[PDB]
Amino acid sequence: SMKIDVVTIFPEYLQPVRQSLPGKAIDAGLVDVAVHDLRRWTHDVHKSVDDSPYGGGPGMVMKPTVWGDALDEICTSETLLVVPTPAGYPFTQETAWQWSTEDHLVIACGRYEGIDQRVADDAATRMRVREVSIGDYVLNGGEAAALVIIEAVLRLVPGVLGNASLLEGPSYTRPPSWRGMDVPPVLLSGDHAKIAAWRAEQSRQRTIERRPDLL
Amino acid sequence: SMKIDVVTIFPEYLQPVGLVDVAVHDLRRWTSVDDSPYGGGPGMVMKPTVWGDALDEICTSETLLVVPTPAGYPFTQETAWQWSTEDHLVIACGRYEGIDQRVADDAATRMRVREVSIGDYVLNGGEAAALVIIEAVLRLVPGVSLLEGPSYTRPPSWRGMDVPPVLLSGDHAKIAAWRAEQSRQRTIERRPDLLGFDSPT
Ligand SMILES: N#Cc1c(-c2ccc3ccn(Cc4ccncc4)c3c2)n[nH]c1N
Ligand SMILES: N#Cc1c(-c2ccc3ccn(Cc4ccncc4)c3c2)n[nH]c1N
């Protein structure tokens, strides 16, 4: 039973999440995802969410006063506050497993150069805060990271998304022959110990080739 | 100029997307897209037949075929730079347990193919990975290491928390030095692998 609140200046970006949520999971009260426009907490007629960086530099920084108000309203002491950032701890499958049993995730999506650091630092004095990165590339903001985190986490919550070391090897299905390429005959052999060993060797070879760091 | 075509059985999920155009294609337009795996196992595999027909129409010999997969080569900022100067990306999004391996194998006989993963976690399909890849690449298209430290803006005191005073001092050398120190500190703590040290636990 998980509530996820996402805060963003581009709420439309989170549309895929609401799309991928089965009615049965919502009706059973297994999951609730709500998306909030950060500008609801702006102070001025211009709905300002950013300002120039202290110490100079390029880009802009999201305002602490706006974010502070948003998180004050949405979070409680029990919230796990997730803050995507290219400077975060790595988000991994282990992370996803840990977070899948949380009652309440709040994902604070930044833009520009990110969020004034005092927002996360202040929040961390009264709730659990996690600054994380989904990989070693640079995005424009936290929304795509939120999509990835939400999917990785919710697919581990029994019955929410509709789904049920070494790298996975190649997979095959019908037809047995296609554009001159036959499915490896071992897979049609009915020798299931041999099939498992073949799959194990494929996994080994692929890991050596594509992810030697895993070895 | 760059053209990006995304192929998926869930075109609705790609909604978040002059020098670049992005087009989304429903795979079913070329048809049941899946069946049980040869050799056994849980779940289903996408059949190569429908994919072959779709890619035949969409791809040329100059196309870079991108195939998200948890078993891919890592997609990194270096990859994003490399792909930023491509004329044509086609992103083939799988579902279920993935796409019959012969799709990528057949495609590689006529174009360049890249199987990639955006990170070490499991998704239900390629669509979210496609959005990440598109965003990382498009921000580098012409005409568009170490972890970054913290950023601050006004007011200089908030909830009794001060912006680090060096950032208000106007001393560029000291500001550069402090920012380097925060950055070093953060990398050691959060990503020691970037500086060639063992990863935690
Ligand atoms: N997680 C994660 C990420 C992000 C990410 C996340 C949040 C924000 C907010 C703002 N930006 C843009 C930006 C900020 C600083 N430096 C450069 C660009 C973000 C990027 N990029 N790459 C990842 N793996
Ligand atoms: N890039 C990337 C990915 C994916 C991903 C990508 C494409 C597909 C198609 C199908 N699935 C689901 C699946 C398949 C096999 N094993 C487990 C789950 C996908 C996952 N997961 N994690 C990543 N970093």
Short mmCIF file of N, CA and C in Angstrom, two decimals, chain A residues 14-158:
data_model
loop_
_atom_site.label_atom_id
_atom_site.label_comp_id
_atom_site.label_asym_id
_atom_site.label_seq_id
_atom_site.Cartn_x
_atom_site.Cartn_y
_atom_site.Cartn_z
N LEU A 14 4.76 13.46 -16.14
CA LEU A 14 4.52 12.27 -15.33
C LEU A 14 3.28 11.50 -15.78
N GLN A 15 2.67 11.96 -16.87
CA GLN A 15 1.50 11.28 -17.46
C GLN A 15 1.69 9.77 -17.71
N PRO A 16 2.88 9.34 -18.21
CA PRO A 16 3.06 7.89 -18.41
C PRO A 16 2.82 7.05 -17.17
N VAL A 17 3.11 7.58 -15.99
CA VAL A 17 2.93 6.83 -14.76
C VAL A 17 1.46 6.50 -14.53
N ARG A 18 0.62 7.53 -14.57
CA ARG A 18 -0.82 7.35 -14.42
C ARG A 18 -1.37 6.38 -15.47
N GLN A 19 -0.78 6.42 -16.66
CA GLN A 19 -1.16 5.52 -17.75
C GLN A 19 -0.91 4.06 -17.41
N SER A 20 0.25 3.78 -16.82
CA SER A 20 0.67 2.40 -16.62
C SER A 20 0.06 1.76 -15.38
N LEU A 21 -0.77 2.50 -14.65
CA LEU A 21 -1.38 2.00 -13.42
C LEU A 21 -2.71 1.29 -13.68
N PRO A 22 -2.76 -0.03 -13.46
CA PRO A 22 -3.97 -0.84 -13.57
C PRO A 22 -5.06 -0.39 -12.61
N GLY A 23 -6.30 -0.35 -13.10
CA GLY A 23 -7.43 0.04 -12.28
C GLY A 23 -7.60 -0.83 -11.05
N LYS A 24 -7.33 -2.13 -11.21
CA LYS A 24 -7.50 -3.09 -10.13
C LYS A 24 -6.60 -2.76 -8.93
N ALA A 25 -5.38 -2.31 -9.20
CA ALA A 25 -4.44 -1.96 -8.13
C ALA A 25 -4.89 -0.70 -7.40
N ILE A 26 -5.40 0.26 -8.15
CA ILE A 26 -5.90 1.50 -7.56
C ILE A 26 -7.17 1.22 -6.76
N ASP A 27 -8.09 0.48 -7.37
CA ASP A 27 -9.35 0.12 -6.72
C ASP A 27 -9.13 -0.69 -5.45
N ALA A 28 -8.07 -1.50 -5.43
CA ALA A 28 -7.73 -2.28 -4.25
C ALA A 28 -6.96 -1.44 -3.23
N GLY A 29 -6.71 -0.18 -3.56
CA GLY A 29 -5.99 0.72 -2.67
C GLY A 29 -4.55 0.32 -2.46
N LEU A 30 -3.96 -0.29 -3.49
CA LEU A 30 -2.58 -0.77 -3.42
C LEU A 30 -1.60 0.36 -3.72
N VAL A 31 -2.05 1.32 -4.51
CA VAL A 31 -1.16 2.37 -4.98
C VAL A 31 -1.93 3.65 -5.30
N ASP A 32 -1.29 4.78 -5.03
CA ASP A 32 -1.82 6.08 -5.40
C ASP A 32 -0.64 6.95 -5.80
N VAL A 33 -0.65 7.44 -7.04
CA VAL A 33 0.38 8.36 -7.51
C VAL A 33 -0.27 9.70 -7.78
N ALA A 34 0.22 10.74 -7.11
CA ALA A 34 -0.29 12.08 -7.33
C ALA A 34 0.84 12.97 -7.80
N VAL A 35 0.54 13.83 -8.77
CA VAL A 35 1.55 14.71 -9.33
C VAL A 35 1.15 16.16 -9.04
N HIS A 36 2.10 16.95 -8.56
CA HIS A 36 1.83 18.31 -8.13
C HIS A 36 2.69 19.31 -8.87
N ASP A 37 2.07 20.37 -9.36
CA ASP A 37 2.79 21.47 -9.99
C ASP A 37 3.46 22.29 -8.91
N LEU A 38 4.79 22.36 -8.95
CA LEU A 38 5.54 23.15 -7.97
C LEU A 38 5.06 24.59 -7.89
N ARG A 39 4.54 25.13 -8.98
CA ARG A 39 4.19 26.55 -9.00
C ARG A 39 3.01 26.88 -8.10
N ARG A 40 2.30 25.85 -7.64
CA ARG A 40 1.25 26.05 -6.65
C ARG A 40 1.81 26.68 -5.36
N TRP A 41 3.10 26.48 -5.10
CA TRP A 41 3.71 27.04 -3.89
C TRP A 41 4.60 28.27 -4.14
N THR A 42 4.51 28.88 -5.32
CA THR A 42 5.27 30.11 -5.57
C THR A 42 4.64 31.28 -4.81
N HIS A 43 5.42 32.34 -4.62
CA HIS A 43 5.01 33.46 -3.76
C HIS A 43 4.57 34.68 -4.52
N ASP A 44 4.90 34.74 -5.81
CA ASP A 44 4.78 35.97 -6.56
C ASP A 44 3.91 35.83 -7.79
N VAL A 45 3.52 36.97 -8.34
CA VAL A 45 2.63 36.95 -9.48
C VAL A 45 3.31 36.30 -10.68
N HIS A 46 4.65 36.31 -10.71
CA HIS A 46 5.37 35.72 -11.84
C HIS A 46 5.63 34.22 -11.66
N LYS A 47 5.12 33.66 -10.57
CA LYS A 47 5.28 32.24 -10.23
C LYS A 47 6.73 31.77 -10.41
N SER A 48 7.65 32.51 -9.79
CA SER A 48 9.08 32.26 -9.92
C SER A 48 9.53 31.00 -9.16
N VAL A 49 10.26 30.12 -9.84
CA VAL A 49 10.76 28.93 -9.16
C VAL A 49 12.28 28.87 -9.12
N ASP A 50 12.94 29.82 -9.78
CA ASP A 50 14.40 29.79 -9.86
C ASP A 50 15.03 31.17 -9.69
N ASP A 51 16.34 31.20 -9.47
CA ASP A 51 17.05 32.43 -9.18
C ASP A 51 18.54 32.17 -9.41
N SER A 52 19.34 33.23 -9.45
CA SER A 52 20.75 33.10 -9.81
C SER A 52 21.59 32.43 -8.71
N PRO A 53 22.63 31.68 -9.12
CA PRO A 53 23.44 30.94 -8.14
C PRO A 53 24.40 31.82 -7.34
N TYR A 54 24.42 31.67 -6.02
CA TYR A 54 25.46 32.32 -5.22
C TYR A 54 26.83 31.79 -5.63
N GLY A 55 27.82 32.67 -5.70
CA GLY A 55 29.16 32.27 -6.09
C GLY A 55 29.31 32.25 -7.59
N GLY A 56 28.23 32.57 -8.29
CA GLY A 56 28.25 32.71 -9.73
C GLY A 56 28.18 31.39 -10.47
N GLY A 57 28.38 31.48 -11.78
CA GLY A 57 28.33 30.31 -12.63
C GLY A 57 27.16 30.39 -13.59
N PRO A 58 27.08 29.42 -14.50
CA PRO A 58 25.99 29.37 -15.48
C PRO A 58 24.77 28.71 -14.88
N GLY A 59 23.63 28.92 -15.52
CA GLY A 59 22.42 28.27 -15.08
C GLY A 59 21.78 28.96 -13.90
N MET A 60 20.66 28.39 -13.48
CA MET A 60 19.87 28.92 -12.37
C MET A 60 19.68 27.84 -11.30
N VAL A 61 19.20 28.24 -10.14
CA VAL A 61 19.02 27.34 -9.00
C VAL A 61 17.58 27.44 -8.50
N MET A 62 16.93 26.31 -8.22
CA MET A 62 15.55 26.41 -7.74
C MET A 62 15.49 26.96 -6.33
N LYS A 63 14.51 27.82 -6.13
CA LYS A 63 14.36 28.58 -4.88
C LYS A 63 14.03 27.71 -3.66
N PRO A 64 14.76 27.91 -2.56
CA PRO A 64 14.45 27.14 -1.36
C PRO A 64 13.09 27.47 -0.74
N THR A 65 12.67 28.73 -0.78
CA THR A 65 11.41 29.09 -0.13
C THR A 65 10.19 28.40 -0.77
N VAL A 66 10.20 28.26 -2.10
CA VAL A 66 9.11 27.59 -2.80
C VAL A 66 9.10 26.10 -2.47
N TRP A 67 10.26 25.47 -2.62
CA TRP A 67 10.37 24.04 -2.31
C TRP A 67 10.08 23.72 -0.85
N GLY A 68 10.54 24.59 0.05
CA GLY A 68 10.30 24.37 1.47
C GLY A 68 8.82 24.32 1.78
N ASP A 69 8.06 25.23 1.19
CA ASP A 69 6.61 25.25 1.39
C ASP A 69 5.95 24.00 0.81
N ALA A 70 6.38 23.59 -0.38
CA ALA A 70 5.80 22.42 -1.03
C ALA A 70 6.02 21.17 -0.19
N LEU A 71 7.26 20.98 0.25
CA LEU A 71 7.57 19.79 1.03
C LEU A 71 6.96 19.81 2.44
N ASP A 72 6.84 21.00 3.02
CA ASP A 72 6.15 21.14 4.30
C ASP A 72 4.74 20.60 4.19
N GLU A 73 4.09 20.88 3.07
CA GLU A 73 2.69 20.49 2.92
C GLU A 73 2.54 19.00 2.62
N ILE A 74 3.42 18.49 1.76
CA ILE A 74 3.27 17.14 1.24
C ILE A 74 3.91 16.07 2.13
N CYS A 75 5.04 16.39 2.75
CA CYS A 75 5.75 15.39 3.54
C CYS A 75 5.30 15.26 4.98
N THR A 76 5.53 14.09 5.57
CA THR A 76 5.43 13.92 7.01
C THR A 76 6.73 13.32 7.51
N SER A 77 6.82 13.10 8.83
CA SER A 77 8.00 12.47 9.40
C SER A 77 8.26 11.07 8.82
N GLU A 78 7.22 10.44 8.28
CA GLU A 78 7.33 9.07 7.78
C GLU A 78 7.71 8.99 6.30
N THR A 79 7.69 10.14 5.63
CA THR A 79 8.01 10.21 4.20
C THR A 79 9.44 9.79 3.90
N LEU A 80 9.62 9.06 2.81
CA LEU A 80 10.95 8.91 2.23
C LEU A 80 11.05 9.90 1.08
N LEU A 81 11.85 10.94 1.28
CA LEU A 81 11.98 11.98 0.27
C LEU A 81 13.10 11.61 -0.68
N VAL A 82 12.73 11.47 -1.95
CA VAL A 82 13.66 11.07 -3.00
C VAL A 82 13.97 12.27 -3.87
N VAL A 83 15.26 12.60 -4.01
CA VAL A 83 15.66 13.76 -4.79
C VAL A 83 16.62 13.32 -5.89
N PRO A 84 16.10 13.15 -7.11
CA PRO A 84 17.01 12.84 -8.22
C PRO A 84 18.05 13.94 -8.40
N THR A 85 19.29 13.55 -8.68
CA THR A 85 20.35 14.51 -8.96
C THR A 85 21.48 13.76 -9.63
N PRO A 86 22.17 14.41 -10.59
CA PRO A 86 23.32 13.74 -11.21
C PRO A 86 24.43 13.49 -10.19
N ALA A 87 24.42 14.20 -9.07
CA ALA A 87 25.40 13.97 -8.01
C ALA A 87 24.93 13.00 -6.93
N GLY A 88 23.89 12.21 -7.20
CA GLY A 88 23.35 11.35 -6.16
C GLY A 88 24.07 10.03 -5.99
N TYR A 89 23.76 9.35 -4.89
CA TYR A 89 24.12 7.95 -4.73
C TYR A 89 23.45 7.15 -5.84
N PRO A 90 24.09 6.08 -6.31
CA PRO A 90 23.46 5.31 -7.39
C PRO A 90 22.14 4.66 -6.99
N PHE A 91 21.12 4.87 -7.81
CA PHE A 91 19.88 4.12 -7.68
C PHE A 91 20.06 2.76 -8.34
N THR A 92 19.89 1.70 -7.56
CA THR A 92 20.03 0.33 -8.07
C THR A 92 18.81 -0.53 -7.75
N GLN A 93 18.85 -1.78 -8.21
CA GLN A 93 17.77 -2.70 -7.94
C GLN A 93 17.59 -2.94 -6.44
N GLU A 94 18.70 -2.94 -5.71
CA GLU A 94 18.66 -3.06 -4.26
C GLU A 94 17.88 -1.89 -3.64
N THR A 95 18.13 -0.70 -4.16
CA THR A 95 17.39 0.49 -3.75
C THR A 95 15.90 0.31 -4.02
N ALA A 96 15.57 -0.13 -5.23
CA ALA A 96 14.18 -0.32 -5.61
C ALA A 96 13.46 -1.30 -4.68
N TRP A 97 14.14 -2.39 -4.33
CA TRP A 97 13.58 -3.36 -3.40
C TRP A 97 13.32 -2.74 -2.04
N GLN A 98 14.29 -1.98 -1.54
CA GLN A 98 14.13 -1.33 -0.24
C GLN A 98 12.95 -0.37 -0.24
N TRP A 99 12.82 0.41 -1.30
CA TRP A 99 11.78 1.43 -1.34
C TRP A 99 10.39 0.86 -1.63
N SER A 100 10.32 -0.36 -2.15
CA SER A 100 9.03 -0.94 -2.52
C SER A 100 8.13 -1.23 -1.32
N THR A 101 8.68 -1.21 -0.11
CA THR A 101 7.86 -1.46 1.07
C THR A 101 7.53 -0.18 1.85
N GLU A 102 7.93 0.97 1.29
CA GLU A 102 7.63 2.26 1.91
C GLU A 102 6.15 2.62 1.81
N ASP A 103 5.62 3.27 2.84
CA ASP A 103 4.24 3.76 2.81
C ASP A 103 4.09 5.02 1.95
N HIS A 104 5.13 5.85 1.93
CA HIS A 104 5.01 7.16 1.31
C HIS A 104 6.33 7.62 0.71
N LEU A 105 6.39 7.69 -0.62
CA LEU A 105 7.53 8.28 -1.32
C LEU A 105 7.14 9.65 -1.83
N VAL A 106 8.02 10.63 -1.67
CA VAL A 106 7.83 11.92 -2.29
C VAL A 106 9.04 12.14 -3.17
N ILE A 107 8.81 12.41 -4.45
CA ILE A 107 9.92 12.61 -5.38
C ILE A 107 9.95 14.06 -5.80
N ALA A 108 11.04 14.73 -5.44
CA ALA A 108 11.19 16.16 -5.72
C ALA A 108 12.02 16.34 -6.98
N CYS A 109 11.36 16.73 -8.07
CA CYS A 109 12.02 16.83 -9.36
C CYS A 109 12.57 18.22 -9.60
N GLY A 110 13.88 18.33 -9.68
CA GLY A 110 14.49 19.60 -10.03
C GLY A 110 14.60 19.87 -11.53
N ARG A 111 14.92 21.12 -11.83
CA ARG A 111 15.28 21.56 -13.18
C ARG A 111 16.43 22.55 -13.03
N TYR A 112 16.92 23.07 -14.16
CA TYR A 112 18.05 24.00 -14.16
C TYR A 112 19.27 23.33 -13.54
N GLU A 113 19.96 23.98 -12.61
CA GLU A 113 21.13 23.35 -12.02
C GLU A 113 20.77 22.45 -10.84
N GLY A 114 19.50 22.47 -10.43
CA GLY A 114 19.05 21.69 -9.29
C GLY A 114 18.40 22.58 -8.24
N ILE A 115 18.21 22.01 -7.05
CA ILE A 115 17.50 22.66 -5.94
C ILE A 115 18.49 23.17 -4.92
N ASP A 116 18.28 24.39 -4.42
CA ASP A 116 19.08 24.93 -3.32
C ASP A 116 19.30 23.82 -2.29
N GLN A 117 20.56 23.57 -1.94
CA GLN A 117 20.90 22.42 -1.10
C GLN A 117 20.24 22.46 0.29
N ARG A 118 19.87 23.65 0.75
CA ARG A 118 19.25 23.75 2.06
C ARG A 118 17.88 23.08 2.14
N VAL A 119 17.21 22.90 1.01
CA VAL A 119 15.92 22.21 1.01
C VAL A 119 16.08 20.76 1.49
N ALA A 120 16.99 20.02 0.87
CA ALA A 120 17.24 18.64 1.24
C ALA A 120 17.85 18.55 2.64
N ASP A 121 18.77 19.47 2.93
CA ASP A 121 19.43 19.47 4.24
C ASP A 121 18.42 19.75 5.37
N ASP A 122 17.53 20.72 5.17
CA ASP A 122 16.47 20.98 6.15
C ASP A 122 15.53 19.77 6.28
N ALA A 123 15.11 19.20 5.15
CA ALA A 123 14.21 18.07 5.21
C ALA A 123 14.82 16.91 5.98
N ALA A 124 16.13 16.73 5.82
CA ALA A 124 16.84 15.61 6.43
C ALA A 124 16.92 15.71 7.95
N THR A 125 16.57 16.86 8.51
CA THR A 125 16.52 16.98 9.98
C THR A 125 15.21 16.45 10.56
N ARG A 126 14.24 16.09 9.71
CA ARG A 126 12.99 15.58 10.27
C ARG A 126 12.35 14.44 9.48
N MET A 127 13.01 14.00 8.41
CA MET A 127 12.58 12.82 7.66
C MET A 127 13.77 12.18 6.97
N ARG A 128 13.56 11.00 6.40
CA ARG A 128 14.61 10.31 5.66
C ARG A 128 14.70 10.88 4.25
N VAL A 129 15.89 11.31 3.85
CA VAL A 129 16.09 11.90 2.53
C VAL A 129 17.13 11.09 1.76
N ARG A 130 16.89 10.90 0.47
CA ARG A 130 17.78 10.13 -0.40
C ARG A 130 18.03 10.87 -1.69
N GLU A 131 19.25 11.37 -1.86
CA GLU A 131 19.69 11.95 -3.12
C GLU A 131 20.24 10.83 -3.99
N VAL A 132 19.66 10.63 -5.17
CA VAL A 132 20.05 9.48 -5.99
C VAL A 132 20.17 9.84 -7.46
N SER A 133 20.98 9.07 -8.18
CA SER A 133 21.13 9.21 -9.63
C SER A 133 20.78 7.91 -10.33
N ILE A 134 20.06 7.99 -11.46
CA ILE A 134 19.68 6.76 -12.17
C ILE A 134 20.73 6.28 -13.18
N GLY A 135 21.81 7.03 -13.36
CA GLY A 135 22.87 6.56 -14.24
C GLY A 135 23.88 7.63 -14.61
N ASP A 136 24.94 7.22 -15.30
CA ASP A 136 26.04 8.14 -15.56
C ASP A 136 25.90 8.87 -16.89
N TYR A 137 24.89 9.72 -16.94
CA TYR A 137 24.58 10.58 -18.07
C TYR A 137 23.85 11.76 -17.46
N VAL A 138 23.74 12.83 -18.24
CA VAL A 138 23.15 14.06 -17.75
C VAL A 138 21.79 14.30 -18.40
N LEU A 139 20.78 14.56 -17.58
CA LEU A 139 19.44 14.90 -18.05
C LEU A 139 19.19 16.39 -17.87
N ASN A 140 18.02 16.86 -18.31
CA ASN A 140 17.63 18.26 -18.11
C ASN A 140 16.98 18.49 -16.75
N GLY A 141 16.55 17.42 -16.11
CA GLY A 141 15.83 17.56 -14.86
C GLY A 141 15.45 16.21 -14.30
N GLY A 142 14.76 16.22 -13.16
CA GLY A 142 14.47 14.99 -12.46
C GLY A 142 13.30 14.15 -12.94
N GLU A 143 12.50 14.67 -13.88
CA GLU A 143 11.26 13.99 -14.26
C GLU A 143 11.48 12.61 -14.89
N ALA A 144 12.43 12.51 -15.82
CA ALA A 144 12.68 11.21 -16.45
C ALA A 144 13.21 10.22 -15.41
N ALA A 145 13.98 10.73 -14.45
CA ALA A 145 14.49 9.88 -13.37
C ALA A 145 13.34 9.40 -12.49
N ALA A 146 12.39 10.29 -12.20
CA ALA A 146 11.21 9.91 -11.45
C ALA A 146 10.43 8.80 -12.17
N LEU A 147 10.30 8.90 -13.49
CA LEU A 147 9.59 7.85 -14.24
C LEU A 147 10.28 6.51 -14.05
N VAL A 148 11.61 6.52 -14.14
CA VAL A 148 12.38 5.29 -13.98
C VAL A 148 12.27 4.72 -12.57
N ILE A 149 12.43 5.58 -11.57
CA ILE A 149 12.33 5.13 -10.19
C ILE A 149 10.94 4.57 -9.86
N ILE A 150 9.90 5.27 -10.30
CA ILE A 150 8.54 4.83 -10.03
C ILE A 150 8.30 3.46 -10.66
N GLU A 151 8.73 3.28 -11.91
CA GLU A 151 8.51 1.99 -12.56
C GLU A 151 9.31 0.86 -11.88
N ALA A 152 10.57 1.13 -11.58
CA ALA A 152 11.44 0.12 -10.97
C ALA A 152 10.92 -0.29 -9.60
N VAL A 153 10.35 0.67 -8.87
CA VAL A 153 9.86 0.39 -7.53
C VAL A 153 8.50 -0.30 -7.57
N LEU A 154 7.57 0.24 -8.35
CA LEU A 154 6.21 -0.28 -8.31
C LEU A 154 6.09 -1.66 -8.93
N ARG A 155 7.01 -2.03 -9.82
CA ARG A 155 6.92 -3.36 -10.40
C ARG A 155 7.30 -4.42 -9.36
N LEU A 156 7.86 -3.99 -8.23
CA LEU A 156 8.21 -4.90 -7.14
C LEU A 156 7.14 -4.97 -6.07
N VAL A 157 6.12 -4.12 -6.20
CA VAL A 157 4.96 -4.20 -5.32
C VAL A 157 3.93 -5.14 -5.92
N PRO A 158 3.67 -6.26 -5.23
CA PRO A 158 2.79 -7.32 -5.74
C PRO A 158 1.48 -6.77 -6.32
#
